[PDB]
């Protein structure tokens, strides 16, 4: 039951169905007590039943509606679990990761398979907490909350902070994703090399694993928080370690278009 706008309020459709049941259940009790003409008692017990269906699952038998405004099936508990896009359903479509990011990609010719160019500006938000603490370890800030306000505005960052982030990211690595993740190589790990601007510098050789060309395809980026997640990420998920495809014993780090033409 929430406060929207103007004082508009917002409540899960479940509550209109619950009241249904409660009112009828109650009206039933009072109808028995008052005295009981058969027809009226059943009449209600009917409605009652129907109601009990409503919350559980709407539509198996008739479809309940909120008053004239939306001829819509009030989401039943079942619709919750199943639905057009419901509970286990979008459970599996996806959830949103806390330490994520996403920008345009651009070819990073000098970059080595090992690494990837990541916008410092992006790194900052991404590795914010890792930086905050690192700030306190140095003279840049007294405490966390301090370190926080110290970065709440763009013009207030001392160049000492970048040296802290560049120090925080030392040997950590992140994951990069492409639009349709079709195979496992659709997500690869690299060592970030912080760079200016907005674009994300990607290696050319792995442009074949991710079906990615540079006319605007954007890649997302995730952060391995546990020392374990990091362990796996850079040991068995990093790029330079997975050279041969799982489909064929054929390499996937093959000199793509430009390299061949040259050689």
């Amino acid at each position: 039951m929430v406060q929207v706008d103007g004082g508009r309020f917002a409540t899960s459709d479940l509550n209109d169905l619950y009241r249904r049941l409660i009112n009828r259940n109650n009206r039933l009790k009072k109808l028995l007590a008052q005295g009981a003409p058969e027809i009226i008692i059943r009449n209600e017990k009917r409605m009652l039943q129907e109601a009990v269906d409503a919350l559980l699952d709407n539509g198996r038998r008739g479809a309940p509606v909120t008053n004239p405004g939306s001829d819509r099936p009030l989401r039943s508990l079942t619709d919750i679990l199943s639905g057009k896009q419901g509970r286990f359903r979008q459970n599996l479509l996806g959830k949103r990761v806390d330490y994520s990011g996403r920008s345009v990609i651009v070819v990073g010719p000098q970059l080595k398979l090992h690494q990837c160019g990541l916008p410092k500006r992006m790194a900052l938000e991404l590795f914010k907490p890792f930086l905050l603490k690192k700030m306190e370890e140095k003279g840049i800030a007294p405490n966390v909350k301090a370190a926080r306000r110290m970065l709440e505005r763009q013009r207030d960052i001392k160049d000492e902070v970048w040296d802290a982030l560049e120090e925080v990211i030392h040997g950590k690595v992140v994951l990069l994703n492409r639009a349709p993740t079709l195979h496992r190589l659709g997500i690869q790990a690299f060592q970030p090399v912080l760079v200016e601007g907005q674009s994300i510098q990607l290696h050319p050789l792995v442009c074949e694993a991710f079906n990615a060309d540079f006319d605007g395809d954007q890649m997302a980026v995730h952060v391995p928080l546990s020392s374990f997640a990091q362990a796996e990420a850079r040991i068995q998920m990093l790029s330079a370690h997975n050279l041969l495809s799982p489909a064929s014993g054929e390499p996937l780090a093959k000199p793509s278009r430009d390299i061949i033409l040259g050689l």
Binding site: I39, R42, N43, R46, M47, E50, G62
Partner: peptide, 12 residues
Amino acid sequence: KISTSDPVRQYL
């Protein structure tokens, strides 16, 4: 089947 008709018929 559908609930109005049945009761209507019922007491009518």
